[PDB]
C-alpha cells in the first residue's frame, strides 16, 4: 500500500526540482545576447568528396590529427580515408553487415564498430605484418549498439539500445561499470573534454549526465518532445546540444540544470540526425532528414546558413579537432568534406 | 620524402580499390531479406531449416544468393533499428492465426514508415491448420472480435481451394482482405504487398520468396525505365 506514497513523494520531488529551476532562472539567453554583432550569412563548398562505399553510411569519426577518418556503412566495410588526398588507407571487411557506429582511438592504433549484433569489435591498425584483424570482441550487451567512444587504449564506452550504457575494458573482455537509469534506447553519447563525464540521449526525450569514475547519474535534462537522436558536448565542457525527432535543437547547461535555447524553424519539420559544434562553439552544424545540414548560431538561435550537397539524408557529421573542416555522411554512400 | 610516401599511398589505394570492386561484384549479386513477424508465428521453424542480435541465413535458389536476417535477440521496441532495413529487397512478414490486431497494427506502421515506403513486404499467413481447427471446433469466434465477418461476403474473384470448406476459405480470405485493405488504403504505387497462405511445413516458401523477389526487381526495372 506504499504505491500512492511513493508516487506522491516523486511528484513532490519533481515539483521541488521545478521550483528550484524556476528560482535559478532570471533572464533567458535571447534577452542577454541581443547586443552582439550577428555572424551573417556563411557558405562552405565541398572541398573533397569521398567515394567507394556501397551502402548507406551510418557513422564516421575523425582522427585526432585531422588527417585520417573512418567510415562505417551497411555493406560490411570499414574504410579509413585520407582527407587531404582522398586515398583509402585501409578497408576492413567486417563479419557483420549491419554496423551502426564506428570510432577512432585517440592514439589511432585501434578502431571500433558496433551494430545489430550487440558486439563491439576492436581492430588493431598499428600492427604491420600484412594482416589487420580484430583484436577483441566485446560481448555482453543485450540491445543493439548505437554509439561507442574511446576513453583510452584500454577503455571504451558503449551505448546499447537496451537503455544501458557500459564502460568496457579491452584486453580483459569484461565490463567495468554499467550505467542504468534510462527508460528508452540510447541513441548517442559524447565524452567530456576532460574525460570524466558523458551525456547520453535516449528515446525517452531526456539526457543524463554520468560519472565515469563512480557510475551514477548526476543530472537529468528534459524539455524535448521526442526521441533524442544525437548529442554533442560544448567545447567548454559545461554544456551540450541535443538533436531530437521533434525538429528542434536544444542547448542544455550542466550548471543551470535547465535548457538555454532552442533552434526551430516553422518552414522545416524534420528530425535531427546528427549534432556537432565548431571549434569556438559559436556554430551548431546539425544535420536534418531533409537531405541537408543547417548551421545554427548558438548564441542567437538564428540560422547562419545551410549545407545542401547531399542526395540523401545525412546520418553522421563531425567537425575536426582543429576546426579546419566539417565532414558529413549521408545515406547515398557519399562522404563529403566542407570547409 | 613525399614522393615515396605518395607512391606507396597510391599503390595501397589502387589495391584497396581493386578489392572494393571485387567485393562489389558479389555484393550486388546477393539480395537481402528481413524476416520479421510477431512471436509464436512459426518463423523459427523456417529459420531452423537454414545470444546474438542478428542471425544470418544464407540460402540460394536458381543460382541466385539470398541473405535472410533474423532479428531475434533484440528488444521489443523497434522504431529505431527498423530504419536500417531500407535497402532490403523485401521484408518477409509472418502472421500467426487479439493476436491478429497487433500484427495488423505492426504491418500498418511498417507500411507508412517514411523510410520503408520504397521497400515491399512479403506476407506469410502462417498456421492455416490452426485457423481451420479453431473455426471448425466453434469454441471461439471471429465475429465478436471483428464486427465485419457478419456482413462479409466471399470474394468470387479467387477461391482456388478444392478440399477446403467454405467457412475456412471465408476466414482465410477475410484475414487476407483485412491486410490488403490496409496495404492498398494509402499506397502510392511505389511498394506492394504479396499475401501468401503457407502452413508450418511448407517447403515451397523459398520458391514463393524467390518469385516475389523476381517480381519486385522486375517492377523496379520497369519503373526505372518509366514504363510503369
Amino acid at each position, epitope marked *: 500500500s506504499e504505491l500512492d506514497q511513493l508516487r506522491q513523494e516523486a511528484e513532490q520531488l519533481k515539483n521541488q526540482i521545478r521550483d528550484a529551476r524556476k528560482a535559478c532562472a532570471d533572464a533567458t539567453l535571447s534577452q542577454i545576447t541581443n547586443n552582439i554583432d550577428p555572424v551573417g550569412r556563411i557558405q562552405m563548398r565541398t572541398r573533397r568528396t569521398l567515394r567507394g562505399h556501397l551502402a548507406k553510411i551510418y557513422a564516421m569519426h575523425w582522427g585526432t590529427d585531422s588527417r585520417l577518418l573512418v567510415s562505417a556503412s551497411q555493406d560490411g566495410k570499414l574504410i579509413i580515408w585520407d582527407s587531404y588526398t582522398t586515398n583509402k588507407v585501409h578497408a576492413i571487411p567486417l563479419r557483420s553487415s549491419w554496423v551502426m557506429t564506428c570510432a577512432y582511438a585517440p592514439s589511432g592504433n585501434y578502431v571500433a564498430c558496433g551494430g545489430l549484433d550487440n558486439i563491439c569489435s576492436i581492430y588493431n591498425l598499428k600492427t604491420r605484418e600484412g594482416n589487420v584483424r580484430v583484436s577483441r570482441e566485446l560481448a555482453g550487451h543485450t540491445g543493439y549498439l548505437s554509439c561507442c567512444r574511446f576513453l583510452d587504449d584500454n577503455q571504451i564506452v558503449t551505448s546499447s539500445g537496451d*537503455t544501458t550504457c557500459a564502460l568496457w575494458d579491452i584486453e580483459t573482455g569484461q565490463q567495468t561499470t554499467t550505467f542504468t537509469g534510462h527508460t528508452g534506447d540510447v541513441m548517442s553519447l559524447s565524452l567530456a573534454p576532460d574525460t570524466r563525464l558523458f551525456v547520453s540521449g535516449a528515446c525517452d*526525450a531526456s539526457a543524463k549526465l554520468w560519472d565515469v569514475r563512480e557510475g551514477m547519474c548526476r543530472q537529468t535534462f528534459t524539455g524535448h518532445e521526442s526521441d533524442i537522436n544525437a548529442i554533442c558536448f560544448f567545447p567548454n565542457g559545461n554544456a551540450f546540444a541535443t538533436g531530437s*525527432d521533434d525538429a528542434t535543437c536544444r542547448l542544455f547547461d550542466l550548471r543551470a540544470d535547465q535548457e538555454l535555447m532552442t533552434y526551430s524553424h516553422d518552414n522545416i519539420i524534420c528530425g535531427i540526425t546528427s549534432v556537432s559544434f565548431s571549434k569556438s562553439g559559436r556554430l551548431l552544424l546539425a544535420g536534418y532528414d531533409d537531405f541537408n545540414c543547417n548551421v545554427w548560431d548558438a548564441l542567437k538561435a538564428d540560422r547562419a546558413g545551410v549545407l545542401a550537397g547531399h542526395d540523401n539524408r545525412v546520418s553522421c557529421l563531425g567537425v575536426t579537432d582543429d576546426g579546419m573542416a566539417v565532414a558529413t555522411g549521408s545515406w547515398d554512400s557519399f562522404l563529403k568534406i566542407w570547409n | 620524402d613525399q614522393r615515396n610516401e605518395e607512391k606507396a599511398q597510391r599503390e595501397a589505394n589502387k589495391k584497396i580499390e581493386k578489392q572494393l570492386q571485387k567485393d562489389k561484384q558479389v555484393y550486388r549479386a546477393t539480395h537481402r531479406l528481413l524476416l520479421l513477424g510477431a512471436g509464436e508465428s512459426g518463423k523459427n521453424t523456417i529459420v531452423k531449416q537454414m545470444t546474438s542480435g542478428i542471425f544470418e541465413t544464407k540460402f540460394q535458389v536458381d543460382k541466385v544468393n539470398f541473405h535472410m536476417f533474423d532479428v531475434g535477440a533484440q528488444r521489443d521496441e523497434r522504431r529505431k533499428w527498423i530504419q536500417c532495413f531500407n535497402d532490403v529487397t523485401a521484408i518477409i512478414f509472418v502472421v500467426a492465426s487479439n493476436r491478429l490486431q*497487433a500484427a495488423l497494427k505492426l504491418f500498418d506502421s511498417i507500411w507508412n514508415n517514411k523510410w520503408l515506403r520504397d521497400t515491399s513486404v512479403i506476407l506469410f499467413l502462417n498456421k492455416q491448420d490452426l485457423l481451420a481447427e479453431k473455426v471448425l471446433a466453434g469454441k471461439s469466434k471471429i465475429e465478436d472480435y471483428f464486427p465485419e465477418f457478419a456482413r462479409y461476403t466471399t470474394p468470387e474473384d479467387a477461391t482456388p481451394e478444392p478440399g477446403e470448406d467454405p467457412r475456412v476459405t471465408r476466414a482465410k480470405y477475410f484475414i487476407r482482405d483485412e491486410f490488403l485493405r490496409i496495404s492498398t488504403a494509402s499506397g502510392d504505387g511505389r511498394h506492394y504487398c504479396y499475401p501468401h497462405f503457407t502452413c508450418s511445413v511448407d517447403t515451397e516458401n523459398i520458391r514463393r520468396v524467390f518469385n516475389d523477389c523476381r517480381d519486385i526487381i522486375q517492377r523496379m526495372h520497369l519503373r526505372q525505365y518509366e514504363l510503369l
Partner: nanobody
Amino acid sequence: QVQLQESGGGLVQPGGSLRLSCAASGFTFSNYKMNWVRQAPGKGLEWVSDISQSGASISYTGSVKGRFTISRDNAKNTLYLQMNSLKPEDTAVYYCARCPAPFTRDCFDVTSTTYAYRGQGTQVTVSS
C-alpha cells in the same frame, strides 16, 4: 517533460458508461497522433483505438467498434474515451499513449511493454 495524466475509472455495474480524460502536458497537442491501450490482468497490453491528428481518421479495435466515441480537444489539451454499455471483459487498466513522432503516421511501438511517453493510467473495473 511529457506527462499524460488520466481521469475516471471505478466500480460500476455492467452496461454502464464511463469517461476517461487524459490531461496532456509538456508538448504541442495538435502535432501528434493519440492511441488508447488497455492491459487486462493476466494478459498483455492491447490497443483499443486511435485518433489521427486534428481528429481526421477515427478507428477502433474489433471488440469496441461501434461502442466508444473518442474526442480530441486540441485547445484544452485533453482526450476522452466515452465508454458506454460496458461488459465484464472490459475490466483493464487504461493508458493514453503519445505517438512517438510529430507529423508522422507510422506511429510505432505504442503497445510496447516499456513505453516512455505513455501515461500513468487509471484502473477501470466492472462488477456487482
